[PDB]
Design a protein around this ligand. Structure first.
Ligand SMILES: [Ca+2]
Ligand SMILES: [Cl-]
Ligand SMILES: [Cl-]
Length: 131
């Protein structure tokens, strides 16, 4: 039960990217497409104002034919892990879809990191994070 959305988009392709991936356009959107390997991650850096629980909405594709578990960490500016959760991204057709979670905890104004990683991210693509 989050607070009101802010109407802000943070593009995946200008987030902090690690591992093996490609930036590609698909159906007019630019996304980060992850490949094989154990060291892949995407980390958005967001700055929040008024204090609330935040909904986090990921625009993504999962072209693998199976649900894909991904570890989410919500991290504060000093490296404190405020939330750790497995998100399961359902398989999608070759079209961008949305997956929502929350910060779980009430967060005050500050700079935060939304980190997604998994042992396997092959076949996941991310367009953006909306808050
Ligand atoms: Ca994008
Ligand atoms: Cl966990
Ligand atoms: Cl689409």
């Amino acid at each position: 039960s989050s607070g009101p959305q802010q109407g802000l988009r943070y593009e995946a392709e200008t987030a902090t990217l690690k591992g093996k991936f490609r930036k590609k356009e698909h159906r007019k959107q630019t996304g980060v497409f992850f490949d094989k390997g154990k060291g892949n991650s995407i980390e958005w850096n967001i700055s929040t104002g008024l204090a609330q629980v935040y909904a986090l909405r990921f625009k993504y594709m999962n072209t693998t034919g199976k649900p894909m578990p991904v570890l989410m960490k919500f991290i504060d500016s000093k490296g404190v892990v405020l939330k750790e959760d497995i998100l399961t991204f359902p398989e999608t057709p070759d079209k961008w879809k949305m997956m929502s979670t929350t910060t779980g905890t009430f967060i005050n104004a500050g700079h935060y990191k939304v980190l997604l990683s998994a042992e396997n991210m092959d076949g996941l693509a991310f367009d953006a994070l909306d808050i």
